[PDB]
Amino acid sequence: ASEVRIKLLLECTECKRRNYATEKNKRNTPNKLELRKYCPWCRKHTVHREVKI
Amino acid sequence: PKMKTHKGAKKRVKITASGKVVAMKTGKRHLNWQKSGKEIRQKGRKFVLAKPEAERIKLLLPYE
RNA sequence: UGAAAUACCACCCUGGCGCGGCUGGGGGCCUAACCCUCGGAUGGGGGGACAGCGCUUGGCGGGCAGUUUGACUGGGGCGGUCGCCUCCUAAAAGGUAACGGAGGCGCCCAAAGGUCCCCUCAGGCGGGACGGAAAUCCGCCGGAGAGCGCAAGGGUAGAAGGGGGCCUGACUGCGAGGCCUGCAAGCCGAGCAGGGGCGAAAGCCGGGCCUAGUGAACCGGUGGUCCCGUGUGGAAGGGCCAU
RNA sequence: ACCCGGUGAAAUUGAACUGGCCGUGAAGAUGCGGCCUACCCGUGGCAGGACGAAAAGACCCCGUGGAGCUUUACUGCAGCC
RNA sequence: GUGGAGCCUGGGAGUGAGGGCGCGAGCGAUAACGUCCGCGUCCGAGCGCGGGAACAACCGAGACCGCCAGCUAAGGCCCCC
RNA sequence: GCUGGGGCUAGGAGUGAAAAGCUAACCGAGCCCGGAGAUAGCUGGUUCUCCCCGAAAUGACUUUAGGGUCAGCCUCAGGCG
RNA sequence: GUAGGGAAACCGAGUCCGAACAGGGCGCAGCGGCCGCAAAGUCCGCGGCCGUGGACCCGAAACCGGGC
RNA sequence: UGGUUCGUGGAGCCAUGGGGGAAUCUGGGCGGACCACCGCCUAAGGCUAAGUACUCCGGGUGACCGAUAGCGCACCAGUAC
RNA sequence: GGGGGGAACCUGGGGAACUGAAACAUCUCAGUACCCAGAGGAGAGGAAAGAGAAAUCGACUCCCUGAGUAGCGGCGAGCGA
Ligand SMILES: [Mg+2]
Ligand SMILES: [Mg+2]
Ligand SMILES: [Mg+2]
Ligand SMILES: [Mg+2]
Ligand SMILES: [Mg+2]
Ligand SMILES: [Mg+2]
Ligand SMILES: [Mg+2]
Ligand SMILES: [Mg+2]
Ligand SMILES: [Mg+2]
Ligand SMILES: [Mg+2]
Ligand SMILES: [Mg+2]
Ligand SMILES: [Mg+2]
Ligand SMILES: [Mg+2]
Ligand SMILES: [Mg+2]
Ligand SMILES: [Mg+2]
Ligand SMILES: [Mg+2]
Ligand SMILES: [Mg+2]
Ligand SMILES: [Mg+2]
Ligand SMILES: [Mg+2]
Ligand SMILES: [Mg+2]
Ligand SMILES: [Mg+2]
Ligand SMILES: [Mg+2]
Ligand SMILES: [Mg+2]
Ligand SMILES: [Mg+2]
Ligand SMILES: [Mg+2]
Ligand SMILES: [Mg+2]
Ligand SMILES: [Mg+2]
Ligand SMILES: [Mg+2]
Ligand SMILES: [Mg+2]
Ligand SMILES: [Mg+2]
Ligand SMILES: [Mg+2]
Ligand SMILES: [Mg+2]
Ligand SMILES: [Mg+2]
Ligand SMILES: [Mg+2]
Ligand SMILES: [Mg+2]
Ligand SMILES: [Mg+2]
Ligand SMILES: [Mg+2]
Ligand SMILES: [Mg+2]
Ligand SMILES: [Mg+2]
Ligand SMILES: [Mg+2]
Ligand SMILES: [Mg+2]
Ligand SMILES: [Mg+2]
Ligand SMILES: [Mg+2]
Ligand SMILES: [Mg+2]
Ligand SMILES: [Mg+2]
Ligand SMILES: [Mg+2]
Ligand SMILES: [Mg+2]
Ligand SMILES: [Mg+2]
Ligand SMILES: [Mg+2]
Ligand SMILES: [Mg+2]
Ligand SMILES: [Mg+2]
Ligand SMILES: [Mg+2]
Ligand SMILES: [Mg+2]
Ligand SMILES: [Mg+2]
Ligand SMILES: [Mg+2]
Ligand SMILES: [Mg+2]
Ligand SMILES: [Mg+2]
Ligand SMILES: [Mg+2]
Ligand SMILES: [Mg+2]
Ligand SMILES: [Mg+2]
Ligand SMILES: [Mg+2]
Ligand SMILES: [Mg+2]
Ligand SMILES: [Mg+2]
Ligand SMILES: [Mg+2]
Ligand SMILES: [Mg+2]
Ligand SMILES: [Mg+2]
Ligand SMILES: [Mg+2]
Ligand SMILES: [Mg+2]
Ligand SMILES: [Mg+2]
Ligand SMILES: [Mg+2]
Ligand SMILES: [Mg+2]
Ligand SMILES: [Mg+2]
Ligand SMILES: [Mg+2]
Ligand SMILES: [Mg+2]
Ligand SMILES: [Mg+2]
Ligand SMILES: [Mg+2]
Ligand SMILES: [Mg+2]
Ligand SMILES: [Mg+2]
Ligand SMILES: [Mg+2]
Ligand SMILES: [Mg+2]
Ligand SMILES: [Mg+2]
Ligand SMILES: [Mg+2]
Ligand SMILES: [Mg+2]
Ligand SMILES: [Mg+2]
Ligand SMILES: [Mg+2]
Ligand SMILES: [Mg+2]
Ligand SMILES: [Mg+2]
Ligand SMILES: [Mg+2]
Ligand SMILES: [Mg+2]
Ligand SMILES: [Mg+2]
Ligand SMILES: [Mg+2]
Ligand SMILES: [Mg+2]
Ligand SMILES: [Mg+2]
Ligand SMILES: [Mg+2]
Ligand SMILES: [Mg+2]
Ligand SMILES: [Mg+2]
Ligand SMILES: [Mg+2]
Ligand SMILES: [Mg+2]
Ligand SMILES: [Mg+2]
Ligand SMILES: [Mg+2]
Ligand SMILES: [Mg+2]
Ligand SMILES: [Mg+2]
Ligand SMILES: [Mg+2]
Ligand SMILES: [Mg+2]
Ligand SMILES: [Mg+2]
Ligand SMILES: [Mg+2]
Ligand SMILES: [Mg+2]
Ligand SMILES: [Mg+2]
Ligand SMILES: [Mg+2]
Ligand SMILES: [Mg+2]
Ligand SMILES: [Mg+2]
Ligand SMILES: [Mg+2]
Ligand SMILES: [Mg+2]
Ligand SMILES: [Mg+2]
Ligand SMILES: [Mg+2]
Ligand SMILES: [Mg+2]
Ligand SMILES: [Mg+2]
Ligand SMILES: [Mg+2]
Ligand SMILES: [Mg+2]
Ligand SMILES: [Mg+2]
Ligand SMILES: [Mg+2]
Ligand SMILES: [Mg+2]
Ligand SMILES: [Mg+2]
Ligand SMILES: [Mg+2]
Ligand SMILES: [Mg+2]
Ligand SMILES: [Mg+2]
Ligand SMILES: [Mg+2]
Ligand SMILES: [Mg+2]
Ligand SMILES: [Mg+2]
Ligand SMILES: [Mg+2]
Ligand SMILES: [Mg+2]
Ligand SMILES: [Mg+2]
Ligand SMILES: [Mg+2]
Ligand SMILES: [Mg+2]
Ligand SMILES: [Mg+2]
Ligand SMILES: [Mg+2]
Ligand SMILES: [Mg+2]
Ligand SMILES: [Mg+2]
Ligand SMILES: [Mg+2]
Ligand SMILES: [Mg+2]
Ligand SMILES: [Mg+2]
Ligand SMILES: [Mg+2]
Ligand SMILES: [Mg+2]
Ligand SMILES: [Mg+2]
Ligand SMILES: [Mg+2]
Ligand SMILES: [Mg+2]
Ligand SMILES: [Mg+2]
Ligand SMILES: [Mg+2]
Ligand SMILES: [Mg+2]
Ligand SMILES: [Mg+2]
Ligand SMILES: [Mg+2]
Ligand SMILES: [Mg+2]
Ligand SMILES: [Mg+2]
Ligand SMILES: [Mg+2]
Ligand SMILES: [Mg+2]
Ligand SMILES: [Mg+2]
Ligand SMILES: [Mg+2]
Ligand SMILES: [Mg+2]
Ligand SMILES: [Mg+2]
Ligand SMILES: [Mg+2]
Ligand SMILES: [Mg+2]
Ligand SMILES: [Mg+2]
Ligand SMILES: [Mg+2]
Ligand SMILES: [Mg+2]
Ligand SMILES: [Mg+2]
Ligand SMILES: [Mg+2]
Ligand SMILES: [Mg+2]
Ligand SMILES: [Mg+2]
Ligand SMILES: [Mg+2]
Ligand SMILES: [Mg+2]
Ligand SMILES: [Mg+2]
Ligand SMILES: [Mg+2]
Ligand SMILES: [Mg+2]
Ligand SMILES: [Mg+2]
Ligand SMILES: [Mg+2]
Ligand SMILES: [Mg+2]
Ligand SMILES: [Mg+2]
Ligand SMILES: [Mg+2]
Ligand SMILES: [Mg+2]
Ligand SMILES: [Mg+2]
Ligand SMILES: [Mg+2]
Ligand SMILES: [Mg+2]
Ligand SMILES: [Mg+2]
Ligand SMILES: [Mg+2]
Ligand SMILES: [Mg+2]
Ligand SMILES: [Mg+2]
Ligand SMILES: [Mg+2]
Ligand SMILES: [Mg+2]
Ligand SMILES: [Mg+2]
Ligand SMILES: [Mg+2]
Ligand SMILES: [Mg+2]
Ligand SMILES: [Mg+2]
Ligand SMILES: [Mg+2]
Ligand SMILES: [Mg+2]
Ligand SMILES: [Mg+2]
Ligand SMILES: [Mg+2]
Ligand SMILES: [Mg+2]
Ligand SMILES: [Mg+2]
Ligand SMILES: [Mg+2]
Ligand SMILES: [Mg+2]
Ligand SMILES: [Mg+2]
Ligand SMILES: [Mg+2]
Ligand SMILES: [Mg+2]
Ligand SMILES: [Mg+2]
Ligand SMILES: [Mg+2]
Ligand SMILES: [Mg+2]
Ligand SMILES: [Mg+2]
Ligand SMILES: [Mg+2]
Ligand SMILES: [Mg+2]
Ligand SMILES: [Mg+2]
Ligand SMILES: [Mg+2]
Ligand SMILES: [Mg+2]
Ligand SMILES: [Mg+2]
Ligand SMILES: [Mg+2]
Ligand SMILES: [Mg+2]
Ligand SMILES: [Mg+2]
Ligand SMILES: [Mg+2]
Ligand SMILES: [Mg+2]
Ligand SMILES: [Mg+2]
Ligand SMILES: [Mg+2]
Ligand SMILES: [Mg+2]
Ligand SMILES: [Mg+2]
Ligand SMILES: [Mg+2]
Ligand SMILES: [Mg+2]
Ligand SMILES: [Mg+2]
Ligand SMILES: [Mg+2]
Ligand SMILES: [Mg+2]
Ligand SMILES: [Mg+2]
Ligand SMILES: [Mg+2]
Ligand SMILES: [Mg+2]
Ligand SMILES: [Mg+2]
Ligand SMILES: [Mg+2]
Ligand SMILES: [Mg+2]
Ligand SMILES: [Mg+2]
Ligand SMILES: [Mg+2]
Ligand SMILES: [Mg+2]
Ligand SMILES: [Mg+2]
Ligand SMILES: [Mg+2]
Ligand SMILES: [Mg+2]
Ligand SMILES: [Mg+2]
Ligand SMILES: [Mg+2]
Ligand SMILES: [Mg+2]
Ligand SMILES: [Zn+2]
């Protein structure tokens, strides 16, 4: 973790609840992360989007 | 005069029915982003304090 | 005729001006609060709504007040050091000290992660325009001396190394059993369920060849939860899960 | 100062029947070992020793002791604006 | 292997200045009654006893009491003895 | 200039031709009484007898290092065998 | 003391985490021929040790208040 | 600002130094910000025994002392100094 | 009518610090010590603009309990209805 390597939350794009915390390098990966993850509310896999922490 | 209950202990801890002392695992107050789900999950549980330390805490809770 | 079209009468809109309200500053003057003064005082003189003083705002402030000003240490100071990782010292289990001998960490990677398929080095000799000790090509030898992001050690091609495809298990809910251990921590983890990835399948997958890349509480922020809600319904404010 | 008559303190003091050397011993021994030396007890003197007396070292360090002082240490207060 | 062995639970501690020696190393100078660890021992707490001239820790040996009785240990057996 | 008598100024205060001098024989903050039996992780001291057992001076952490908390080592009761 | 589990609502020999009917955490339990008898627990005495208080005793340098 | 368990906290209540500044029951204060509902209570005048505290004084009684004890003083002691 | 006095006791107006927090500032010690005013044989308080959930109680004082509960708290030490 640094200024370039930031922490972030992953928000389930269906129910908007933040289910995961992780990191990326915003110089190497400037665009928002989209990753399919299991959402424990929706009880299914969902695209989660990077949201600010 | 009569002993006073330690409120710091009382707000952190519980004496179970059999005389054990139970607390919350330390280490998930913050700095959690890079901690695995296994670390965060298992830190959500209570745990049984070691006997030498539980005996000390229990003397602090004379009226429980 | 345009979107609305016309004489006339209201409500209001723009902006401006004048008389007024009511107040904000500013300049000038007044006197009577208030202050000073005057053999004389229900007065005259001077200052004057200021100054002084009351409440409140921010500031300057060793004049004064309470304190703080770490440890290790071949005495103390000075210098150095303080946590974490690797090797040695370490006396062939584990552990093991000195201000003993040598190095490194406080990051990083969206692939440098999961799976499936494929591939195999450094180096030496000979050969090949520009082209060299070393660019790229060919041939022979070459078990690992290369490589594996970065220290060092262990490990390793019957891959952990190089390439590609599909991907997000860098899961959620747990967790038998252990390693280590004064505590608190740190560590490894099969297996079950949920919903997935890859593979024909057997299967693998809960980040990364491994060991450093870190910080207990308290106090507070943000998202969710909808558990508490001080007669009642709400609300304030808390709790819980996540960060 | 000394001797006689008169009056008569003090700090200090575990107890003492309290010698030298060479050793030893917590590392400088009257007190231990070996040896040497030494009849009992005073009086005037000298200060080398009794790590002699006095003062629970002022130096030095240590104690999360104190106090005076300083300042662009911290945080207040007077005072001033 | 029945021992002031071991294990479980609980009451009470003290200790957290060690020191000498032997061996193994580091530091030091193949110095220190030096220093810092490891294995062991003894002193500490056995300054009780014998030996080592004397002498915590070297050698011999673990002192319940008594005896004008015997055997040994280390070390000794010319005199002190 | 010295001096008598009569007066005033005091404790974070006075007074000082300045030495932190002096303020009733010790002043970097007077004296008395009170808070008060301040506090002292320091030094000292701790009183009859007999009997059994019997340590530690390590490790971890500590504004900690001559102090502590836990563990180790001692002891007593119960239980196991 | 006779009920615990949960932050709580609440449920209860269970409860909490969870989607779970999974798994785990914390909980739940006398001898003889009805009675003795031993017993939860509790009351009182006694003893060890801890907390509060000066707390085994003596000792500061100092700090503060009111006077002299 | 103070008081309260409440140290600014969601901070109500009771008190009030400053500023502003009402109403007379259809008025007003309270039930912990606040609003509604529902209840409780009548501020800005005063007094009021008893149950409670203390022990200079008097008496009674001690698993209280017995002249270094017990009051500082058993005695011509708050004296001598 | 007042003045001055009285061992403690009481109320009101002012109001520390050592200490504890193993440093220290919020906090604690504590509204304690102490100063001052006043009161009496007591003083204070006292007849709901109370309490707080009981569809309830019924001045105040004082004891027991509630309760080291509720809460307060560098959520520390502690404080405490
Ligand atoms: Mg607390
Ligand atoms: Mg935690
Ligand atoms: Mg959290
Ligand atoms: Mg949080
Ligand atoms: Mg990681
Ligand atoms: Mg994970
Ligand atoms: Mg995660
Ligand atoms: Mg969870
Ligand atoms: Mg209770
Ligand atoms: Mg109970
Ligand atoms: Mg004028
Ligand atoms: Mg005029
Ligand atoms: Mg005038
Ligand atoms: Mg004028
Ligand atoms: Mg003015
Ligand atoms: Mg203002
Ligand atoms: Mg101001
Ligand atoms: Mg300053
Ligand atoms: Mg100062
Ligand atoms: Mg202080
Ligand atoms: Mg500090
Ligand atoms: Mg400092
Ligand atoms: Mg410091
Ligand atoms: Mg030091
Ligand atoms: Mg040195
Ligand atoms: Mg050294
Ligand atoms: Mg030296
Ligand atoms: Mg030394
Ligand atoms: Mg330095
Ligand atoms: Mg080793
Ligand atoms: Mg080794
Ligand atoms: Mg080894
Ligand atoms: Mg070995
Ligand atoms: Mg081990
Ligand atoms: Mg060093
Ligand atoms: Mg790729
Ligand atoms: Mg080649
Ligand atoms: Mg070539
Ligand atoms: Mg060429
Ligand atoms: Mg070439
Ligand atoms: Mg290699
Ligand atoms: Mg490197
Ligand atoms: Mg690959
Ligand atoms: Mg791949
Ligand atoms: Mg697909
Ligand atoms: Mg386990
Ligand atoms: Mg452990
Ligand atoms: Mg670690
Ligand atoms: Mg970690
Ligand atoms: Mg599955
Ligand atoms: Mg599946
Ligand atoms: Mg599958
Ligand atoms: Mg398939
Ligand atoms: Mg499958
Ligand atoms: Mg698995
Ligand atoms: Mg990698
Ligand atoms: Mg890889
Ligand atoms: Mg890594
Ligand atoms: Mg933390
Ligand atoms: Mg804190
Ligand atoms: Mg919080
Ligand atoms: Mg919330
Ligand atoms: Mg609700
Ligand atoms: Mg409500
Ligand atoms: Mg409504
Ligand atoms: Mg409701
Ligand atoms: Mg709402
Ligand atoms: Mg809420
Ligand atoms: Mg969390
Ligand atoms: Mg003569
Ligand atoms: Mg004479
Ligand atoms: Mg004699
Ligand atoms: Mg003689
Ligand atoms: Mg010698
Ligand atoms: Mg000698
Ligand atoms: Mg002699
Ligand atoms: Mg003799
Ligand atoms: Mg002798
Ligand atoms: Mg002799
Ligand atoms: Mg001799
Ligand atoms: Mg002799
Ligand atoms: Mg001689
Ligand atoms: Mg003589
Ligand atoms: Mg002499
Ligand atoms: Mg001399
Ligand atoms: Mg002389
Ligand atoms: Mg002598
Ligand atoms: Mg001499
Ligand atoms: Mg001398
Ligand atoms: Mg002397
Ligand atoms: Mg002394
Ligand atoms: Mg001394
Ligand atoms: Mg000294
Ligand atoms: Mg000197
Ligand atoms: Mg000095
Ligand atoms: Mg020194
Ligand atoms: Mg000092
Ligand atoms: Mg300090
Ligand atoms: Mg210290
Ligand atoms: Mg200090
Ligand atoms: Mg000071
Ligand atoms: Mg002072
Ligand atoms: Mg001025
Ligand atoms: Mg034994
Ligand atoms: Mg034993
Ligand atoms: Mg036995
Ligand atoms: Mg005992
Ligand atoms: Mg005992
Ligand atoms: Mg000790
Ligand atoms: Mg101890
Ligand atoms: Mg120590
Ligand atoms: Mg030590
Ligand atoms: Mg030592
Ligand atoms: Mg040692
Ligand atoms: Mg040795
Ligand atoms: Mg030998
Ligand atoms: Mg050696
Ligand atoms: Mg070594
Ligand atoms: Mg030499
Ligand atoms: Mg030595
Ligand atoms: Mg040596
Ligand atoms: Mg040596
Ligand atoms: Mg030894
Ligand atoms: Mg000793
Ligand atoms: Mg011996
Ligand atoms: Mg022994
Ligand atoms: Mg001996
Ligand atoms: Mg001896
Ligand atoms: Mg002897
Ligand atoms: Mg001997
Ligand atoms: Mg001998
Ligand atoms: Mg002999
Ligand atoms: Mg000897
Ligand atoms: Mg010796
Ligand atoms: Mg024996
Ligand atoms: Mg014989
Ligand atoms: Mg022999
Ligand atoms: Mg001989
Ligand atoms: Mg003979
Ligand atoms: Mg004169
Ligand atoms: Mg005069
Ligand atoms: Mg005079
Ligand atoms: Mg004057
Ligand atoms: Mg004066
Ligand atoms: Mg005066
Ligand atoms: Mg003073
Ligand atoms: Mg004073
Ligand atoms: Mg000053
Ligand atoms: Mg002055
Ligand atoms: Mg002068
Ligand atoms: Mg005097
Ligand atoms: Mg004087
Ligand atoms: Mg003087
Ligand atoms: Mg003084
Ligand atoms: Mg002073
Ligand atoms: Mg002072
Ligand atoms: Mg004086
Ligand atoms: Mg007084
Ligand atoms: Mg006190
Ligand atoms: Mg004292
Ligand atoms: Mg102190
Ligand atoms: Mg005693
Ligand atoms: Mg024995
Ligand atoms: Mg140690
Ligand atoms: Mg620790
Ligand atoms: Mg430390
Ligand atoms: Mg340390
Ligand atoms: Mg130190
Ligand atoms: Mg030292
Ligand atoms: Mg200490
Ligand atoms: Mg212990
Ligand atoms: Mg044992
Ligand atoms: Mg034990
Ligand atoms: Mg037993
Ligand atoms: Mg419970
Ligand atoms: Mg269960
Ligand atoms: Mg839940
Ligand atoms: Mg169970
Ligand atoms: Mg019975
Ligand atoms: Mg019973
Ligand atoms: Mg105890
Ligand atoms: Mg006390
Ligand atoms: Mg005491
Ligand atoms: Mg005690
Ligand atoms: Mg002070
Ligand atoms: Mg001071
Ligand atoms: Mg002061
Ligand atoms: Mg004064
Ligand atoms: Mg107010
Ligand atoms: Mg307050
Ligand atoms: Mg709060
Ligand atoms: Mg409040
Ligand atoms: Mg307040
Ligand atoms: Mg008000
Ligand atoms: Mg007012
Ligand atoms: Mg009404
Ligand atoms: Mg109204
Ligand atoms: Mg009101
Ligand atoms: Mg209200
Ligand atoms: Mg109310
Ligand atoms: Mg309410
Ligand atoms: Mg009411
Ligand atoms: Mg009225
Ligand atoms: Mg009254
Ligand atoms: Mg009556
Ligand atoms: Mg009355
Ligand atoms: Mg009465
Ligand atoms: Mg009475
Ligand atoms: Mg009487
Ligand atoms: Mg008697
Ligand atoms: Mg009698
Ligand atoms: Mg007498
Ligand atoms: Mg007497
Ligand atoms: Mg007599
Ligand atoms: Mg009398
Ligand atoms: Mg007397
Ligand atoms: Mg007398
Ligand atoms: Mg007399
Ligand atoms: Mg008067
Ligand atoms: Mg009076
Ligand atoms: Mg009177
Ligand atoms: Mg008062
Ligand atoms: Mg008054
Ligand atoms: Mg007051
Ligand atoms: Mg008062
Ligand atoms: Mg004052
Ligand atoms: Mg203080
Ligand atoms: Mg104190
Ligand atoms: Mg304390
Ligand atoms: Mg205290
Ligand atoms: Mg303190
Ligand atoms: Mg302290
Ligand atoms: Mg201090
Ligand atoms: Mg303080
Ligand atoms: Mg207070
Ligand atoms: Mg008093
Ligand atoms: Mg009466
Ligand atoms: Mg009255
Ligand atoms: Mg009335
Ligand atoms: Mg109760
Ligand atoms: Mg208080
Ligand atoms: Mg009460
Ligand atoms: Zn979702």
JSON list of C-alpha atoms (C1' of nucleotides) in Angstrom, two decimals, chain C residues 48-111:
[
{"chain": "C", "resi": 48, "resn": "G", "atom": "C1'", "xyz": [-18.24, 62.90, 25.58]},
{"chain": "C", "resi": 49, "resn": "A", "atom": "C1'", "xyz": [-21.76, 58.62, 23.86]},
{"chain": "C", "resi": 50, "resn": "C", "atom": "C1'", "xyz": [-16.00, 58.02, 23.24]},
{"chain": "C", "resi": 51, "resn": "A", "atom": "C1'", "xyz": [-13.42, 56.44, 27.49]},
{"chain": "C", "resi": 52, "resn": "G", "atom": "C1'", "xyz": [-14.29, 53.39, 31.89]},
{"chain": "C", "resi": 53, "resn": "C", "atom": "C1'", "xyz": [-16.72, 49.26, 33.51]},
{"chain": "C", "resi": 54, "resn": "G", "atom": "C1'", "xyz": [-20.11, 44.09, 32.84]},
{"chain": "C", "resi": 55, "resn": "C", "atom": "C1'", "xyz": [-20.87, 39.56, 29.52]},
{"chain": "C", "resi": 56, "resn": "U", "atom": "C1'", "xyz": [-18.77, 37.39, 25.22]},
{"chain": "C", "resi": 57, "resn": "U", "atom": "C1'", "xyz": [-15.02, 36.46, 20.42]},
{"chain": "C", "resi": 58, "resn": "G", "atom": "C1'", "xyz": [-10.16, 35.72, 18.61]},
{"chain": "C", "resi": 59, "resn": "G", "atom": "C1'", "xyz": [-5.17, 37.09, 19.39]},
{"chain": "C", "resi": 60, "resn": "C", "atom": "C1'", "xyz": [-0.18, 38.36, 21.67]},
{"chain": "C", "resi": 61, "resn": "G", "atom": "C1'", "xyz": [1.77, 36.66, 26.07]},
{"chain": "C", "resi": 62, "resn": "G", "atom": "C1'", "xyz": [8.69, 32.73, 30.62]},
{"chain": "C", "resi": 63, "resn": "G", "atom": "C1'", "xyz": [5.70, 38.52, 33.63]},
{"chain": "C", "resi": 64, "resn": "C", "atom": "C1'", "xyz": [3.98, 34.00, 36.32]},
{"chain": "C", "resi": 65, "resn": "A", "atom": "C1'", "xyz": [2.26, 28.67, 37.02]},
{"chain": "C", "resi": 66, "resn": "G", "atom": "C1'", "xyz": [2.19, 23.21, 36.59]},
{"chain": "C", "resi": 67, "resn": "U", "atom": "C1'", "xyz": [5.06, 19.78, 34.22]},
{"chain": "C", "resi": 68, "resn": "U", "atom": "C1'", "xyz": [7.61, 16.95, 30.47]},
{"chain": "C", "resi": 69, "resn": "U", "atom": "C1'", "xyz": [12.61, 16.41, 28.64]},
{"chain": "C", "resi": 70, "resn": "G", "atom": "C1'", "xyz": [12.96, 7.32, 27.12]},
{"chain": "C", "resi": 71, "resn": "A", "atom": "C1'", "xyz": [16.01, 2.94, 27.37]},
{"chain": "C", "resi": 72, "resn": "C", "atom": "C1'", "xyz": [20.41, -0.18, 26.12]},
{"chain": "C", "resi": 73, "resn": "U", "atom": "C1'", "xyz": [25.49, 1.06, 27.43]},
{"chain": "C", "resi": 74, "resn": "G", "atom": "C1'", "xyz": [32.29, -3.05, 29.95]},
{"chain": "C", "resi": 75, "resn": "G", "atom": "C1'", "xyz": [30.57, 3.96, 34.63]},
{"chain": "C", "resi": 76, "resn": "G", "atom": "C1'", "xyz": [27.84, 8.09, 32.44]},
{"chain": "C", "resi": 77, "resn": "G", "atom": "C1'", "xyz": [27.93, 11.42, 28.44]},
{"chain": "C", "resi": 78, "resn": "C", "atom": "C1'", "xyz": [29.02, 11.65, 23.10]},
{"chain": "C", "resi": 79, "resn": "G", "atom": "C1'", "xyz": [28.41, 8.24, 18.95]},
{"chain": "C", "resi": 80, "resn": "G", "atom": "C1'", "xyz": [25.69, 3.96, 17.67]},
{"chain": "C", "resi": 81, "resn": "U", "atom": "C1'", "xyz": [21.08, 1.22, 18.56]},
{"chain": "C", "resi": 82, "resn": "C", "atom": "C1'", "xyz": [15.67, 0.01, 19.52]},
{"chain": "C", "resi": 83, "resn": "G", "atom": "C1'", "xyz": [10.36, -3.76, 15.29]},
{"chain": "C", "resi": 84, "resn": "C", "atom": "C1'", "xyz": [10.62, -7.43, 11.21]},
{"chain": "C", "resi": 85, "resn": "C", "atom": "C1'", "xyz": [13.48, -11.10, 7.58]},
{"chain": "C", "resi": 86, "resn": "U", "atom": "C1'", "xyz": [18.19, -14.19, 6.03]},
{"chain": "C", "resi": 87, "resn": "C", "atom": "C1'", "xyz": [23.01, -16.46, 7.18]},
{"chain": "C", "resi": 88, "resn": "C", "atom": "C1'", "xyz": [26.82, -17.51, 10.80]},
{"chain": "C", "resi": 89, "resn": "U", "atom": "C1'", "xyz": [28.30, -17.68, 15.91]},
{"chain": "C", "resi": 90, "resn": "A", "atom": "C1'", "xyz": [24.80, -22.31, 17.80]},
{"chain": "C", "resi": 91, "resn": "A", "atom": "C1'", "xyz": [28.72, -27.18, 20.72]},
{"chain": "C", "resi": 92, "resn": "A", "atom": "C1'", "xyz": [24.73, -32.59, 13.98]},
{"chain": "C", "resi": 93, "resn": "A", "atom": "C1'", "xyz": [16.63, -32.18, 17.73]},
{"chain": "C", "resi": 94, "resn": "G", "atom": "C1'", "xyz": [14.47, -27.33, 19.42]},
{"chain": "C", "resi": 95, "resn": "G", "atom": "C1'", "xyz": [16.29, -23.15, 21.79]},
{"chain": "C", "resi": 96, "resn": "U", "atom": "C1'", "xyz": [20.60, -20.24, 23.13]},
{"chain": "C", "resi": 97, "resn": "A", "atom": "C1'", "xyz": [24.13, -14.12, 24.60]},
{"chain": "C", "resi": 98, "resn": "A", "atom": "C1'", "xyz": [27.56, -9.75, 23.67]},
{"chain": "C", "resi": 99, "resn": "C", "atom": "C1'", "xyz": [27.84, -2.16, 21.54]},
{"chain": "C", "resi": 100, "resn": "G", "atom": "C1'", "xyz": [29.98, -10.44, 18.10]},
{"chain": "C", "resi": 101, "resn": "G", "atom": "C1'", "xyz": [30.74, -11.41, 12.09]},
{"chain": "C", "resi": 102, "resn": "A", "atom": "C1'", "xyz": [27.79, -10.18, 7.25]},
{"chain": "C", "resi": 103, "resn": "G", "atom": "C1'", "xyz": [23.20, -8.48, 4.50]},
{"chain": "C", "resi": 104, "resn": "G", "atom": "C1'", "xyz": [18.13, -7.00, 3.80]},
{"chain": "C", "resi": 105, "resn": "C", "atom": "C1'", "xyz": [12.42, -5.12, 5.04]},
{"chain": "C", "resi": 106, "resn": "G", "atom": "C1'", "xyz": [8.57, -0.82, 6.09]},
{"chain": "C", "resi": 107, "resn": "C", "atom": "C1'", "xyz": [7.28, -2.89, -0.83]},
{"chain": "C", "resi": 108, "resn": "C", "atom": "C1'", "xyz": [5.25, -5.09, -4.99]},
{"chain": "C", "resi": 109, "resn": "C", "atom": "C1'", "xyz": [1.74, -7.98, -8.98]},
{"chain": "C", "resi": 110, "resn": "A", "atom": "C1'", "xyz": [-5.05, -7.05, -12.18]},
{"chain": "C", "resi": 111, "resn": "A", "atom": "C1'", "xyz": [-0.97, -10.72, -13.32]}
]
